[PDB]
Swiss-Prot record, chain A:
Its EC number is 3.4.19.-. The keyword Disulfide bond does not apply. This is 26S proteasome non-ATPase regulatory subunit 14. It comes from the Eukaryota. Residues 8-143 form the MPN domain.
Swiss-Prot record, chain B:
Belongs to the proteasome subunit S1 family. Component of the 26S proteasome, a multiprotein complex involved in the ATP-dependent degradation of ubiquitinated proteins. This complex plays a key role in the maintenance of protein homeostasis by removing misfolded or damaged proteins, which could impair cellular functions, and by removing proteins whose functions are no longer required. Therefore, the proteasome participates in numerous cellular processes, including cell cycle progression, apoptosis, or DNA damage repair. This is 26S proteasome non-ATPase regulatory subunit 1. The chain holds residues 767 to 917 of 953 of the full protein. It comes from the Eukaryota.
């Protein structure tokens, strides 16, 4: 009877199974169900996003196997946690992550039973790191135009969710849809160990490995001459006697730094034998 | 400060405001008639010279720049006691 700005404290395994489900999720779009717990009104959590069989027929509401639901929750009951579904996921791995024409039915088909049933759109087949590729929305309906479409209660969460506001047919779909807010949990219980294995492993394992050293320097110094002659083809172009050149057109760099850190590596490699030996 | 997070934070600025006015309270109910001067130009009277009239409790709204150019009166029944430099509610003495 009241509307507040929600929040999704994600288990990272949710997005991990979404990225596996999208990476291995061959760009034919696919459907599944989301499993969390409705904590309160202004927040929700997703603790789990489970897997589906290879339903390569079409995304529809019929694709949910209820015996798979029963056995899935049962195998969670013989495991430690018998949690509750919060909704449904799906995958849009080819195009620009916007609500398909079956989703516009199955969202309210699922939230006729559940409370919120927030959609989750994914596309890890965008590119590799710097996009934030996750997309979630909350179906507002024509029943709720009675009062205004403005929860607003905690603001600047929907204000920074409003800060992109950018997908073509979705900002067309301000109608029927207001998004939900997705932050990523204080995950130090896993971010701790991801950091620790990450840097205890992504440098030489046991880290006694490199401590290749010199014929790579031979090839690198021949690089560092073969490009240095075209490096020095620039101060002749700085002799414009008076002035005949629009702005510096600067090619000083990229051969300071390579020489700098590469021969830092070579001099500390010359250290390395006098280091390992005593 | 951060009133998006909680809309009552925008309400919470109650205790943050003190008056810039001038009050001739010699006796707690008494309303006397004093006329001192504010030596600013009379365009600091802009409320959205020779002298001023800032007395007669309501008190008169004052400017802090007006609070540093003031001068006590000489002809009233009530020529004050302390040299005045603080606003709000202040001193008065009969002479
Ligand atoms: Zn999908």
């Amino acid at each position: 009877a009241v509307d507040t700005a929600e929040q999704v404290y994600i288990s990272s395994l949710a997005l991990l199974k979404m990225l596996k489900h999208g990476r291995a999720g061959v760009p034919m779009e696919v459907m599944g169900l989301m499993l969390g717990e409705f904590v309160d009104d202004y927040t929700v959590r997703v603790i789990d996003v489970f897997a589906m069989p290879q339903s390569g027929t079409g995304v529809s509401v019929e694709a949910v196997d209820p015996v798979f639901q029963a056995k899935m929750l049962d195998m969670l009951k013989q495991t430690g946690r018998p949690e509750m579904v919060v909704g449904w996921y799906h995958s849009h791995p080819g195009f620009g992550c916007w609500l398909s024409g079956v989703d516009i039915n199955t969202q309210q088909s699922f939230e006729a039973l559940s409370e919120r049933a927030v959609a989750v759109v994914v596309d890890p087949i965008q590119s590799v790191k710097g996009k934030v590729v996750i997309d979630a929305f909350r179906l507002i309906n024509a029943n709720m135009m009675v009062l205004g479409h403005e929860p607003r209660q905690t603001t600047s969460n929907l204000g920074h969710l409003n800060k992109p506001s950018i997908q073509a047919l979705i900002h067309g779909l301000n109608r029927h849809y207001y998004s939900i807010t997705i932050n990523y949990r204080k995950n130090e219980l896993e971010q701790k160990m991801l950091l620790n294995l990450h840097k205890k492993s992504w440098m030489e394992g046991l880290t006694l490995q490199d401590y290749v050293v010199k014929e790579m320097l031979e090839l690198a110094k021949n690089y560092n001459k073969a490009v240095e002659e075209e490096d020095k083809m620039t101060p002749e172009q700085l002799a414009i006697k008076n002035v005949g050149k629009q702005d510096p057109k600067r090619h000083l760099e990229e051969h300071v730094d390579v020489l700098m850190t590469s021969n830092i590596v070579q001099c500390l490699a010359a250290m390395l034998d006098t280091v390992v030996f005593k | 400060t951060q009133f998006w997070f909680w809309f009552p934070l925008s309400h919470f600025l109650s205790l943050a405001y003190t008056p810039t006015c001038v009050i001739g309270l010699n006796k707690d109910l008494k309303m006397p008639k004093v006329q001192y001067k504010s030596n600013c130009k009379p365009s600091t009277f802009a409320y959205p010279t020779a002298k001023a009239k800032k007395k007669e409790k309501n008190p008169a709204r004052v400017m802090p720049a007006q609070l540093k150019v003031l001068t006590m009166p000489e002809t009233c029944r009530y020529q004050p006691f302390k040299p005045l430099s603080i606003g709000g509610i202040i001193i008065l003495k009969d002479t």
